[PDB]
Amino acid sequence: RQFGHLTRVRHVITYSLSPFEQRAFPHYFSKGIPNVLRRTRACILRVAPPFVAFYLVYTWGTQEFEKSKRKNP
Amino acid sequence: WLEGIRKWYYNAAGFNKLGLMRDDTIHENDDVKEAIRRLPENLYDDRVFRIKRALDLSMRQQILPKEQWTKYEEDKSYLEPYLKEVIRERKEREEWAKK
Amino acid sequence: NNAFIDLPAPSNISSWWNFGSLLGICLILQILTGLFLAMHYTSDTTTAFSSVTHICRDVNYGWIIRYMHANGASMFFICLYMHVGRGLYYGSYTFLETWNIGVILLLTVMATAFMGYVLPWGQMSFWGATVITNLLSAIPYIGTNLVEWIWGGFSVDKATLTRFFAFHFILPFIIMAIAMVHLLFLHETGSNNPTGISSDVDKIPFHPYYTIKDILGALLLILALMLLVLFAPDLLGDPDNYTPANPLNTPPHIKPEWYFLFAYAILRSIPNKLGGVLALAFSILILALIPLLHTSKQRSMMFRPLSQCLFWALVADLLTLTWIGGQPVEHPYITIGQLASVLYFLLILVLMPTAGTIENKLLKW
Amino acid sequence: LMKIVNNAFIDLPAPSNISSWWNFGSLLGICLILQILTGLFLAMHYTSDTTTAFSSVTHICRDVNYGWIIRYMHANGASMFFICLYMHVGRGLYYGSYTFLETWNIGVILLLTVMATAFMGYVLPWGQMSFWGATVITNLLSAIPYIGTNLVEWIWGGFSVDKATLTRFFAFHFILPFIIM
Amino acid sequence: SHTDIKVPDFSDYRRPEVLDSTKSSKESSEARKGFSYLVTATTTVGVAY
Amino acid sequence: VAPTLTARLYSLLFRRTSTFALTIVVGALFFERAFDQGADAIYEHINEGKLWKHIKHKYENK
Amino acid sequence: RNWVPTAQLWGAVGAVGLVSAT
Amino acid sequence: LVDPLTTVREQCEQLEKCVKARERLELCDERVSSRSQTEEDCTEELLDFLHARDHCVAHKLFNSLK
Amino acid sequence: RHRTKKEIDQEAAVEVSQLRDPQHDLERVKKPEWVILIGVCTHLGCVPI
Amino acid sequence: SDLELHPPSYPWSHRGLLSSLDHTSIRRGFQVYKQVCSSCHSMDYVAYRHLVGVCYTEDEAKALAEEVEVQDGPNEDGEMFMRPGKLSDYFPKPYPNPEAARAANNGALPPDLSYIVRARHGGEDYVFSLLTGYCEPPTGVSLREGLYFNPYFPGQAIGMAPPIYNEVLEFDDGTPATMSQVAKDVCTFLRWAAEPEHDHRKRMGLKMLLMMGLLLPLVYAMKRHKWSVLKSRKLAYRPPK
Ligand code: HEC
Ligand code: HEM
Ligand code: HEM
Ligand code: HEM
Ligand SMILES: C/C=C(C)/C=C/C=C/[C@H](OC)[C@@H](C)[C@@H](OC)[C@@H](C)CCc1oc2c(O)c(OC)cc(OC)c2c(=O)c1C
Ligand SMILES: C/C=C(C)/C=C/C=C/[C@H](OC)[C@@H](C)[C@@H](OC)[C@@H](C)CCc1oc2c(O)c(OC)cc(OC)c2c(=O)c1C
Ligand code: FES
Secondary structure, eight states: OOTTSSOOOOSEEEEOOOTTTBOSSTTHHHHHHHHHHHHHHHHHHHHHHHHHHHHHHHHHHHHHHHHTTSSOO | OHHHHHHHHHHHHOGGGGTOOGGGGSOOOHHHHHHHHTSOHHHHHHHHHHHHHHHHHHHTTOOOOGGGSOOGGGOOOSSHHHHHHHHHHHHHHHHHHHO | OOSSTTOEEETTOOGGGTHHHHHHHHHHHHHHHHHHHHTTOOOOTTTHHHHHHHHHHHSTTHHHHHHHHHHHHHHHHHHHHHHHHHHHHHTGGGSHHHHHHHHHHHHHHHHHHHHHHHTTOBHHHHHHHHHHHGGGGGSTTTHHHHHHHHHTSSSSOHHHHHHHHHHHHHHHHHHHHHHHHHHHHHHHHOOOOTTOSOOGGGEEEHHHHHHHHHHHHHHHHHHHHHHHHHHOTTTTSOGGGGSBOOTTOOOTTOOOOGGGHHHHHHHHTSSSHHHHHHHHHHHHHGGGGGGGGOOOSSSSSTTOHHHHHHHHHHHHHHHHHHHHHTSOSOTTHHHHHHHHHHHHHHIIIIIHHHHHHHHHHHTTO | OOSOOXOOSTTOOOOTTOOGGGTHHHHHHHHHHHHHHHHHHHHTTOOOOTTTHHHHHHHHHHTSTTHHHHHHHHHHHHHHHHHHHHHHHHHHHHHTGGGSHHHHHHHHHHHHHHHHHHHHHHHTTOSHHHHHHHHHHHGGGGGSTTTHHHHHHHHHTSSSSSHHHHHHHHHHHHHHHHHHO | OGGGOOOOOOTTTBOGGGOOTTSOTHHHHHHHHHHHHHHHHHHHHHHHO | OOOOHHHHHIIIIISSHHHHHHHHHHHHHHHHHHHHHHHHHHHHHHTTTTSHHHHGGGTOOO | OTHHHHHHHHHHHHHHHHHHHO | OOOHHHHHHHHHTTSHHHHHHHHHHHHHHHHHHTOSSOSOOSHHHHHHHHHHHHHHHHHHGGGSOO | OBOOHHHHHHHHTSOGGGSSSOOOGGGTOSSTTBOOOOOOOTTTSOOOO | OOOOOOOOOOOOTTOSTTOOOOHHHHHHHHHHHHHTGGGTOOOTTOBHHHHBTTTBOHHHHHHHHHTSEEEEOOOTTSOOEEEEOOTTSBOOOSSSSHHHHHHHTTTOOOOOOSSTTTSSTTHHHHHHHHHTOOOOOOTTOOOOTTOEEOTTSTTSEESSOOOOOTTSSOOTTOOOOOHHHHHHHHHHHHHHHHOTTHHHHHHHHHHHHHHHHHHHHHHHHHHHHHHHHHHTOEEEEOOOO
8 A cells, every 4th residue: 555546535635834833732731631521521431330330349249258258247 | 212312322423523424434345435436526525525524633532613513414325325236236246146 | 665664554543553563562572581581591390490590680680681571471461452452442353364363463472471481480380381281181082192292291391391491482483473464464454543434535654653653652661661670570470480380289379370360260160171161262262253243334433332332341341350360269259250251252242243233223224 | 375475486487497506595495494393393302501401412312202313303404404505605606696696695694694503503412512612613703802802701601611601502593593594 | 716725824833933924934943943853862862871 | 143042052963964963972971970870869868878888888997 | 075074973973872882 | 675566566456446356356265265165266356356456566666676 | 198087977978979970989999098199180280289 | 267367568668669678677687597597498599699798798798608518529539528608609508308398397398588578478568477476376276286376377377486586686786686676677688588689670760760751751742743744734625616
């Protein structure tokens, strides 16, 4: 796969600046944090639950194990 | 209403947030590639730009302003008539190959 | 050039795409530290353990090369699991050749690390050699013969240690050749990306964009490796391997290396010899079936909520199995492990393909 | 899978008249595979500690099933390797094959690497020739001004040929053939 | 017309020294290249160490 | 008319590929002595009175 | 041409490299 | 010659959690002690007690050692 | 292993038909107070405790 | 019993990430091993030369080695003989083999101590707790002769009688030899024995953290510099209408 033979594109214009003319960290915190927060919130419902379940199974099983090793659980 | 979870799903899937239409997201196999090749200039060029705009947003880990999100009610299958025929043609050939 | 410099790459691949180069680095690191350790290691059972302590106590910087090799093997697995997870989530497995070679790579690295762990001839070395080679005894009619043939005798002994040094020595170079083939098949298609949509309309050159990003990734890998080597070299290891091998006694709380714990939990959950071995083999080989189980009209899970939820359930389940593998075969761990083992195969063989179909329906195609 | 196995073998165009002198290239490939195969099998029973190296070799020849044939096949295979190497180089000089500059110069590197490889292998059984061969040849480096002696002791891992030397030589001898390949 | 094509505004990304369209950017080029190349030289020094 | 610092550095050491490599060689050498001396000092201070070099005087007397 | 002055700073780099590094 | 371990243990045994544990321990000692036959022993009660006392010892002890 | 009387009696009392590898204890020993075995787990080779 | 008592965390002075071992404590700990533990426990991977520049000077270590006799030979008559020890000698073994060791210890085997701290969960926290944790068996527990109750040993029945107690030895520096002090020093010595590279890896780790503190943001800056070309690029679609 070589540039020149990838695919067909028509009517698209792209404007760019030299890396020497611009900042490498534009609005790093001012805009970065909001974006991180957004991304974090957008996925949390899909990522976290299974791990919460793991936590519950983990704490439940460990406690159940200890309790079972003593005279009066 | 199924339809109720459908609009919910559409927004949860989220390709609309990148400005994509459902057909822009189909997995490309040979049937699909042939269908894309058969698209008229305008549908092809529009597809290219929406995909290019989406790849750019993805690279910046960004999404479009909500007003620019593809709207569920307005998303239409521009690829369907083409892909359906490509599949029909292949099935016909496969039938003939068995006789 | 054109295999690197002007290689076209998607403009949007994320950090999850850094693990391939990190695996290459883990491989080089293991080969370099490995060769240097091999310059001072002797494979006779009377002197193996001794030669390792000699490396750590008297060879100049022998200790750092050794712990870099030990912890490097752990980093190798962390990266391997991240690499496979990326592939499942983003549908990279549709690149069939690349994917299946990858499965071979996973098995070869597992076999390679197993044999290396036997080399210092500590307690875990010895019992690991015993148990794992015995997996072959589940093969009907000839299984036991295969095991004795591998051992070079009726039990793990000198003949075993000496050939394992030889196998462990050459296998990584074979892995390197297999990895080059892995990349060649990949180059025929170029990389997949987070969207699962062709990126031919927006390719950028690998250099300088990903060369610098890979270097940043390499720096982070080295930080993680060195935090372990310089601040907690034994954290991911097992104290029992600091005890020379004793053929008359298996430690009471013997447990596998952490990266093998999930598979060990699965095997332990089945109270049948052949059944446990078949489940073990299948827990890895099922990776070869993933492509055939793909029902979604879309390649990646990025736009598939239901699939994502089941994906993280699988990761959480492997985390559960890893924890269970580290616990004694007692209540309620026996049952939690059996459920987790069943859930593993159920998510891959049934729930995920089903979520794929439901999602298709919801999108009307 | 097909191509490069293929157009790199099956339909490879070849002169209609190359003689038997052109057979040594494939014979060298075969000597290399032979050495690698018998080598790996010997390495499955060989131990590099000076207290047990010589012993492990007699154990191979006396007690390992067919150990003797694998060992003498490895020893004599090294001789066949050189016979072929010298015939191969002679063919090249006589027929002007050296005009293929890249192929030729890589060949010179191959000759040197096989010589170094065979040298180290000979040291492994730790007999008298093994020991003095290790001593003399490594010392060739002592002719290097300023650092020669330092380089030698570094290679030896000490002030004389000893345990550290034998153990690293097993490692070098093990990997070099694959590099040659 | 292609003459209807104007480059979008980049003022939000420009280094401060090249924000004035009525000034020569050459006056700050050595300073700008010096900053980035200094990051590169220091990095190479740390890597050599 | 005095140019900035990065500007002088660009013109004096970074512009020429020869001079840019010299600067990194020499820089690394100075960086090496200062960094090792500094870090060693931090380490020894954090562990004042515990290292062999700190108690050694009590047992020697050549 | 510029090669002497560039070969001379490349010269210097190697030297200082060895000296230091070694 | 007094071992600070003695002092510190004495101090630590004053904690509510340690007294409670010692009590359960003596309750077990009395219970087990009075039967000519019994499978039970007071290992669990002793370990609970020690776990509480030693957690406390570990936080103080080393201040008294060189 | 030198077995005690209680141990010998416990093994005699076993419901052989319920075993996966059915054998009476007396089919496995010559002198009951002595059990001699190859200490290798028939599963995957470890040493039973 | 199957009950477990896990050891608490003692605030060892070498506990911290950048904290070295206390070498005066290693030195006293060596005295403990020497005077007390060496009669039953071997330490096969430590030689007198290892103590040099760690807790003893070369001459002190030389004198220590000479305090014992080691076997050497054969001489020109083909016989073995005894000689004063030297720096290259490994610490003397108390028994010729484990069988003799077990025989000398009611069947129990004192393990070699070179790696005991790395060979046990809890490390020195475990060893310190074991040494200072012997106590009477709880009511209802009766041990066979030869065994001692120790709550920290697995199963709580150990074949080692309490080896240390107040004044079990006298330290070269006059430090009061209370049982806890003796345990604390031998444990510090055992850490050093199991991990002689202990101090050097932490010094190196400090340098690694500092270098990473420098290199990571710089490379990241290099990454952002190159990528800015793409991160601020703007697209426009102008199809013919
Ligand atoms: C002989 C009289 C001994 C002296 C003196 C010391 N130890 Fe010992 N030790 C001895 C035996 C017979 C055993 C085996 C105990 C068993 O039941 O298995 C041991 C064991 C230990 C252990 C290991 C415990 C474990 O977890 O397996 C340690 C850490 C230990 N001993 C330490 C130790 C130290 C540091 C000593 C000097 C203060 C010491 N022991 C003396 C016998 C004897
Ligand atoms: C020694 C082990 C391995 C090495 C060195 C290795 C290396 C690589 C490299 C260099 C890449 C490109 C960068 C990337 O996208 O990550 C890659 C891609 C990929 N690898 Fe691996 N790999 C290894 C193991 C595996 C395994 C075990 C699997 C999965 C079972 C696998 C599956 C893939 C797939 C499907 C791709 C394409 C990724 C995409 O484009 O999305 N690899 N590998
Ligand atoms: C895929 C790459 C490799 C992996 C995953 C790997 C893994 C391992 C593992 C897990 C151990 C046990 C470490 C321990 O706890 O001591 C080990 C030991 C060892 N390995 Fe490797 N290894 C690799 C490559 C190599 C190579 C190429 C060599 C040598 C040519 C090598 C030489 C050694 C030696 C001699 C030891 C024994 C000393 C020791 O235990 O550190 N390894 N290896
Ligand atoms: C270019 C290929 C090779 C050459 C020319 C070569 C040459 C030699 C020679 C001359 C000896 C001494 C034979 C003797 O005992 O008289 C030797 C020994 C040995 N070689 Fe190789 N060897 C080759 C490849 C290998 C490889 C790939 C391995 C192992 C992976 C290997 C392993 C050994 C071993 C174990 C010995 C010691 C046992 C013995 O002396 O037969 N060799 N080799
Ligand atoms: C000559 C070469 C040979 C024979 C190579 C064989 C390779 C086999 C497989 O690799 C492909 C194998 C390593 C891989 O199975 C897929 C692992 C996940 C198996 C994991 C595994 O580990 C254990 C382990 O490490 C132990 O250590 C002390 C102890 C163990 O039980 C007591 C186990 C164990 O019960 C299992 C299942
Ligand atoms: C770590 C690896 C190292 C140091 C490798 C070094 C390799 C060097 C060369 O290979 C490239 C070298 C083998 C090659 O020189 C071109 C040979 C033709 C040299 C032949 C050679 O053999 C001897 C030999 O075998 C002996 O045996 C008992 C004894 C010998 O005198 C007493 C010699 C001897 O006087 C020479 C010149
Ligand atoms: S239970 Fe598996 S080896 Fe014994």
